[PDB]
Design an enzyme around this catalytic site. Structure first.
Site, short mmCIF file in Angstrom:
data_model
loop_
_atom_site.label_atom_id
_atom_site.label_comp_id
_atom_site.label_asym_id
_atom_site.label_seq_id
_atom_site.Cartn_x
_atom_site.Cartn_y
_atom_site.Cartn_z
N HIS A 153 23.60 17.85 25.32
CA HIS A 153 23.63 16.81 26.35
C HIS A 153 24.94 16.03 26.36
CE1 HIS A 153 22.93 13.38 23.61
NE2 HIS A 153 21.74 13.83 23.24
N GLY A 167 25.00 6.26 19.91
CA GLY A 167 26.14 6.95 19.30
C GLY A 167 25.76 7.79 18.10
N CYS A 210 23.69 10.27 18.10
CA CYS A 210 23.39 11.67 18.45
C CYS A 210 24.30 12.66 17.71
CB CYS A 210 23.45 11.89 19.95
SG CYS A 210 22.09 11.05 20.80
#
Lengths: 300, 300
Positions: free
Chosen positions: B41, B143, B145
Site C-alpha cells: 500500500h 509511520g 507500517c
C-alpha cells in the site's frame, strides 16, 4: 494506538556483552573501548562470600586468572582494578562496536531497558522501573549477573544498572556502572532484604493519561481535588506524595488530553477508594506505576 | 526469579530496517540480501485506497519512484515486483548485516517480538501474541507500517509478521513475509473489523505454571478435573478448548512442578468461577494468555 511495556532496541548493547570467567564462576561483562566491566563478586568463592575482604581477594589475583570471551574471540586481559563493587578488566582490544555512551545513575521511579544475558550471550530484553526501595522486579536466573540496564537517546546509550544479586523476595539488586549499589544492599552474604515499597504516583497518573489518549475514559469525572487533599489520600494508600514538579512534568499530557492534572488526581482518588468495579484500564485490572511521563509521551 | 513479557534481542533485525518512500508516503522496509520488503500500500494515494487495483497501480510505477534509505545511505532500486500484499524492491547492494533468516507463518496463540520502527529507525521492542481472531494488540503509531515481528532461535531470525494497518478497535492487522494477511483483512479501505476473540487456554495454564515456579501457589487445590468437564467450563467463559496435544505440550512444566495438567485445570476452573478475591498472580489481577509454554520454559 495500543500501549505496551516497550524496551529500547538492544543492538547497541548486544555488541558489548562478553563472558567473564574467574575460577569456577562465569558471568557477564560489559565491553566498552578497551575495558570490561563486571561484578567484583566474580572473584569470590562460595566461602569468600561471608565477610569477603575484596581488596585482599583481588591482590591474590592476576590478569591471567580472568578469562574474557567476546563471542568466540578470547580477549587478553592486560590490567585489572576495582572500582567500588565493579571490576575493570583492561583488555588488549578496544571494542569496535562501542556505541556513544554515558554512565548515568537513575532515580527511583525511573524506567530502563534490561538486556538479560547468560554466558555473554543476550537472551531477552524487557523494561524495568527502579522501585522507591531501590530494588527492581526483573527476570533473572543463575548466570545473569553482569547484565545491564540502559536507556537510549539519539544513539547514545546511558547505562544505569549492572545486575549483582537476587534478594529473598525474588526482587533484584545491583549497582550503577561506577559500582555503587542502588539501595542499602551489599555484595556479601547477609540476611539483607528489600525494604518497604510504595507506589509511584506520578507514573500512575501518566499511565491514566496514556489510557485516555488510547480511548479509555470510564474513570474520568467532572470533579477536581487539591494537591493537599490528594496527598492525604496518597499517604493512606501507600502512594508516593505528589509534588508541584510532578504536576508540572505532567503538563504536556494534561494539555494534550485537556484534562487538568488535579482533575486526573480526583479520578485516581476514586479508583483507590472504590476500585475498578470489574473494569480494566489499558488491559490491566491494577493501577500500573512502571511507565514514566516520558514513556507515555514516547509511545502515545 | 521474576516473570516479564520479554522480547528477543533486536540487534539482528535493527540492521535490516530501512526507509521506503513512494510519492508522499514514507514507511519501513526489511532489507535482506539484495531485496527490500515493504507493504504494497506504499504505492497508493489516499484516493487509491478505495477499490485499488494494485496491478494497475504498480505497472504505472518505475524503479526511480521508490526511494530507499539505509541510515543515511541511499539504496538504488533496480527492480520491483509484487508478491501478494508485499512489494519486493530489488536493490543494487546486498545487506552486509543480513542474518540467517526464515519466513515462517505463525499460528494464533503463538508469540513474537515486534521491532516498532518509524522512518526506517527502530524505536522500541515488545512481545505480542497472534490472537485467535488473527489480530495483534500492538503499539503502533502513524509511520509504523512495514515494522516486523519475529522470533530468534540459535541466531536464525524467523520473521513472521509485517505491519499493514490499524483496525477500528485499536488492534493491528498484517501479513506474513510472503505478503499473505493473517485473518480476513485487506489492504484497502473498508469497514473491516476484528472478529470475536477468545482466551488462549493453553497459554493461561503455562502462565499458572510460571507462577507456581516463581512461588505463587494460593490458587492450587487438591482437586482434579476431566478434560471434558474442563472444556465445558472453558466454553462458558469464552476460552479456547484444551486438547490432548495441549496437555502433552504442558508435560515438561507439569513434571517440573509436580502438578498434573488436569490438576492445574481444576485451579483454572476455580479462578474463572470465583475470581481471585483480591489476590494477584505474577503481579497481575487478570489471567494472562500471551505467554506460550515455550515462553515460560525459556524464562523460568
Amino acid at each position: 494506538s495500543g500501549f505496551r511495556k516497550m524496551a529500547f532496541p538492544s543492538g547497541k548493547v548486544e555488541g558489548c556483552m562478553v563472558q567473564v570467567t574467574c575460577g569456577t564462576t562465569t558471568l557477564n561483562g560489559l565491553w566498552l573501548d578497551d575495558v570490561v566491566y563486571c561484578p567484583r563478586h566474580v572473584i569470590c568463592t562460595s566461602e569468600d562470600m561471608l565477610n569477603p575482604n575484596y581488596e585482599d581477594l583481588l591482590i591474590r589475583k592476576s590478569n591471567h586468572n580472568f578469562l574474557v570471551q567476546a563471542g568466540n574471540v578470547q580477549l587478553r586481559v592486560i590490567g585489572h582494578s576495582m572500582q567500588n563493587c565493579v571490576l575493570k578488566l583492561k583488555v588488549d582490544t578496544a571494542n569496535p562496536k562501542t556505541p556513544k555512551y554515558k554512565f548515568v545513575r537513575i532515580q527511583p521511579g525511573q524506567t530502563f531497558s534490561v538486556l538479560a544475558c547468560y554466558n555473554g550471550s543476550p537472551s531477552g530484553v524487557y523494561q524495568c522501573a527502579m522501585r522507591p526501595n531501590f530494588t527492581i522486579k526483573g527476570s533473572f536466573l543463575n548466570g545473569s549477573c553482569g547484565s545491564v540496564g540502559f536507556n537510549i537517546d539519539y544513539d547514545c546509550v546511558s547505562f544505569c544498572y549492572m545486575h549483582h544479586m537476587e534478594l529473598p523476595t525474588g526482587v533484584h539488586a545491583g549497582t550503577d556502572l561506577e559500582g555503587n549499589f542502588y539501595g542499602p544492599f551489599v555484595d556479601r552474604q547477609t540476611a539483607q532484604a528489600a525494604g518497604t515499597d510504595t507506589t509511584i504516583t506520578v507514573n500512575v497518573l501518566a499511565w491514566l493519561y496514556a489510557a485516555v489518549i488510547n480511548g479509555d475514559r470510564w474513570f474520568l469525572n467532572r470533579f477536581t481535588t487539591t494537591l493537599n487533599d490528594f496527598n492525604l489520600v496518597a499517604m493512606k494508600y501507600n502512594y508516593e506524595p505528589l509534588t508541584q514538579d510532578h504536576v508540572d512534568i505532567l503538563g504536556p499530557l494534561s494539555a494534550q488530553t485537556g484534562i487538568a492534572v488535579l482533575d486526573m488526581c480526583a479520578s485516581l482518588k476514586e479508583l483507590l477508594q472504590n476500585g475498578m468495579n470489574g473494569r480494566t484500564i489499558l488491559g490491566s485490572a491494577l493501577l500500573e506505576d512502571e511507565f514514566t511521563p516520558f514513556d507515555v509521551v514516547r509511545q502515545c
